[PDB]
Structure 1
Amino acid sequence: KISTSDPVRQYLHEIGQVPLLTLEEEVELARKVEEGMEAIKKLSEITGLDPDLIREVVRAKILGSARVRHIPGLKETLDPKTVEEIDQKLKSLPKEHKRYLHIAREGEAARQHLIEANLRLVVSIAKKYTGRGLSFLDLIQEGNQGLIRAVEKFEYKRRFKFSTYATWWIRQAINRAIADQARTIRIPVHMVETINKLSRTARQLQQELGREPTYEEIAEAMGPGWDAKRVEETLKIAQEPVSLETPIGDEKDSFYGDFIPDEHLPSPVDAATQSLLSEELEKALSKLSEREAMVLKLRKGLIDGEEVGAFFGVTRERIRQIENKALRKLKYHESRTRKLRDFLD
């Protein structure tokens, strides 16, 4: 059943059963998130385990079983035996350091009740960067990834609360997504703003002449180094890919693709040429000696188009020597039994 509503009901439902208290619940969970960090680092300290390993072991114990680790990241961590060994050292950590294990876990979990509560924040924000060329669900989701981004950095010590914080960490994530995925051909953020500027300038210029600007206006109004070659180039990159499939002429079954020719494929006149050219060139190449003909034939025909570097031990003067004397006798008889002249291209 049509998607948007189900998701909306889904996280609005859970927010409904649990928004976060303006203070108490955003502070609570924040503080737990942090002690989690402080806890996991001290855990690495005492265990010699990478903070990355401590982070994934506690996450498996709080977020999910063998199922999660095995399907998502494929099996580098053994499903049962491996993480279990890691939790064992966590237990052996006496009264002092066990504390951190028990804290890391609760911190991780805390991190989740905070991310659930603030999904309405995302959607409300995400509800405004809607017509950029991204799906609402795609938009809310990237924004969602941004809010999780915020959870990493929030310093509850600095009193300001998570709302204004998630706002930025989200709006960034969404503006990136819109620039990174909204197109069929990837353009940098600089060429995007550039296009917006160009567009906006064309708007101001559509304000008074009654002349959709010659790209003279566009260069001037935009600024410093803008010239015609530029704007023409810019708007050419702006236009989106038209469909290789689109209605054509007197709209009927005629699909645009049958119209476009093909260029690498040798159309029969080209296979025929290759045949004659190859056999005739191959006959001539045999009536020469190998050394400087194969050198220029392979140097030219085989690899990459280096007089000096073209011939083996023998220097330049035997190259040019043979290059140019075999090359001309090869031509000059090819002139007599004219096989090559009719230009095969």
Structure 2
Amino acid sequence: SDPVRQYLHEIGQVPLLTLEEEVELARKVEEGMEAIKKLSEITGLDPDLIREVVRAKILGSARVRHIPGLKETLDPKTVEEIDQKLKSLPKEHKRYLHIAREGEAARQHLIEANLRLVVSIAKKYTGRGLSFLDLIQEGNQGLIRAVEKFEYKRRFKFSTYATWWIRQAINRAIADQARTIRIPVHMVETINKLSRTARQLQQELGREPTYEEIAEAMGPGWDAKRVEETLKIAQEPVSLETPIGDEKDSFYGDFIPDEHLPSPVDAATQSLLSEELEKALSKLSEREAMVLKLRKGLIDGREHTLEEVGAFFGVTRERIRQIENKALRKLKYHESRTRKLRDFLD
């Protein structure tokens, strides 16, 4: 019922590796990687396509799916075709097919063996934005990189090299998802550095630091203004459903207006403006009203150049500019008289 207890059980199924069993699975993995390289040398097919085919038949038909790097869609038809053209090899070549299969199975068994290291490492990363189980699955991506990159020949135990890629993976996830508004990795590291700096400064000052103390202890290039802006960028969003009162009647969204959709006052004012603009445009002849309705864009939404208004009216650009002048002047006179439009200038 409790997902992490269930997953701790599934993990305690696979027993841990003896130094021999670990070195053996490691070695088989390295040699199967080698064998896929050799099988590409032999067949001239793409090493990644080769790897995905060997992997397909290892895991089973339960899982075959299109791979993004692969230039070909990986369905049972084409994996049967390529598995057949692989089985059509000489003994000393088809031997590399058997090698790759064994290497894939060693890979799965070594991963599933070291699945508990991931848990023991991610338990120290909770309360940092991400769920325990989210943290374990990122540690599992770390375990996968580490299996595919491990060199038994260096004589090091597996745990030592895996722990690096596991820590790497968990930290990249924490820095990549824990924020609703996502902030690049380098910037998150800068923010955290600034955190720890201010904490040192306060733990020695007996009080919080100002922007200036932090801009000093942070180093050159950093002025108080920059500390300020970096903080303003780090400011996480807050929930609309965060309550204000003991009762559930009170949310925080219930106080935020909507400044996008216009108010009925606003819309009505635009309507009265449109109508009064029409009323004062009609005192112009339809040519000068039309020249202005084009040169500003109250019709069709866009304003025209003088060449367009003159090639529409069949008149020179000086003449259409001139009847625009006189249209504007007659509108200014009508406005000095009736004063019907002043109230809309705000």
TM-score (normalizing by structure 2): 0.81
Alignment deviations for residues 58-93 of structure 1 (CA, whole Å, 9 cap, x no partner): 222111215543899999847442221111101101
Distance 1:126 1:209, change over 3 A: closer
Alignment deviations for residues 217-236 of structure 1 (CA, whole Å, 9 cap, x no partner): 22222221222322222333
Matching residue of 2:30: 34
Distance 1:151 1:203, change over 3 A: same
Alignment deviations for residues 196-216 of structure 1 (CA, whole Å, 9 cap, x no partner): 222222223323544423322
Distance 1:225 1:147, change over 3 A: same
Equivalent pairs, count: 341
Alignment deviations for residues 245-268 of structure 1 (CA, whole Å, 9 cap, x no partner): 222257551222121111111111
Distance 1:231 1:75, change over 3 A: closer
SS in 1 for 2:249: strand
Say which is worse superposed, 42-51 or 9-18, in terms of deviation: 9-18
In the TM superposition, residue 185 of structure 1 has moved relative to its aligned partner by 0.9
Say which is worse superposed, 204-213 or 119-128, in terms of deviation: 204-213
In the TM superposition, residue 178 of structure 1 has moved relative to its aligned partner by 0.4
In the TM superposition, residue 131 of structure 1 has moved relative to its aligned partner by 2.2
SS in 1 for 2:257: coil
8 Å CA contact retained: 1:11, 1:120: no
Provide the C-alpha distance between the structure 2 equivalents of 1:312 and 1:48, rounded to a whole number of angstroms: 71
Alignment deviations for residues 86-124 of structure 1 (CA, whole Å, 9 cap, x no partner): 111011012122112111111111101100110111111
8 Å CA contact retained: 2:86, 2:97: yes
**Unmatched segments (≥5 aa) in structure 2:** 302-306
Provide the C-alpha distance between the structure 1 equivalents of 2:141 and 2:232, rounded to a whole number of angstroms: 33
In the TM superposition, residue 165 of structure 1 has moved relative to its aligned partner by 0.7
Matching residue of 2:13: 17
Say which is worse superposed, 35-44 or 184-193, in terms of deviation: 35-44
Distance 1:184 1:293, change over 3 A: farther
SS in 1 for 2:183: coil
Q: Does 2:339 align with 1:343?
A: no
Distance 1:245 1:6, change over 3 A: closer
Question: Quick one: higher RCO (CA 8 Å, sep 6+), 1 or 2?
Answer: 1
Say which is worse superposed, 217-226 or 228-237, in terms of deviation: 228-237
In the TM superposition, residue 52 of structure 1 has moved relative to its aligned partner by 2.6
Provide the C-alpha distance between the structure 1 equivalents of 2:299 and 2:107, rounded to a whole number of angstroms: 59
8 Å CA contact retained: 1:77, 1:83: no
Distance 1:215 1:54, change over 3 A: same
Match of residue 204, structure 1, among 194, 200, 205? 200
In the TM superposition, residue 22 of structure 1 has moved relative to its aligned partner by 4.8
Provide the C-alpha distance between the structure 1 equivalents of 2:230 and 2:122, rounded to a whole number of angstroms: 29
Say which is worse superposed, 222-231 or 298-307, in terms of deviation: 298-307
In the TM superposition, residue 317 of structure 1 has moved relative to its aligned partner by 5.9
Matching residue of 1:233: 229
Distance 1:84 1:184, change over 3 A: same
8 Å CA contact retained: 1:14, 1:117: no
In the TM superposition, residue 125 of structure 1 has moved relative to its aligned partner by 1.1
Distance 1:50 1:323, change over 3 A: farther
In the TM superposition, residue 162 of structure 1 has moved relative to its aligned partner by 1.8
TM-score (normalizing by structure 1): 0.81
Distance 1:240 1:300, change over 3 A: farther
Alignment deviations for residues 166-192 of structure 1 (CA, whole Å, 9 cap, x no partner): 011111111000000111111122222
Distance 1:293 1:237, change over 3 A: farther
Distance 1:160 1:67, change over 3 A: closer
In the TM superposition, residue 295 of structure 1 has moved relative to its aligned partner by 8.5
Alignment deviations for residues 113-161 of structure 1 (CA, whole Å, 9 cap, x no partner): 1001101111111111122121111111101101101112112333323
8 Å CA contact retained: 1:19, 1:117: yes
8 Å CA contact retained: 1:58, 1:104: yes
Provide the C-alpha distance between the structure 1 equivalents of 2:138 and 2:5, rounded to a whole number of angstroms: 19
Identity %: 100
SS in 1 for 2:73: coil
8 Å CA contact retained: 1:288, 1:326: yes
In the TM superposition, residue 328 of structure 1 has moved relative to its aligned partner by 3.9
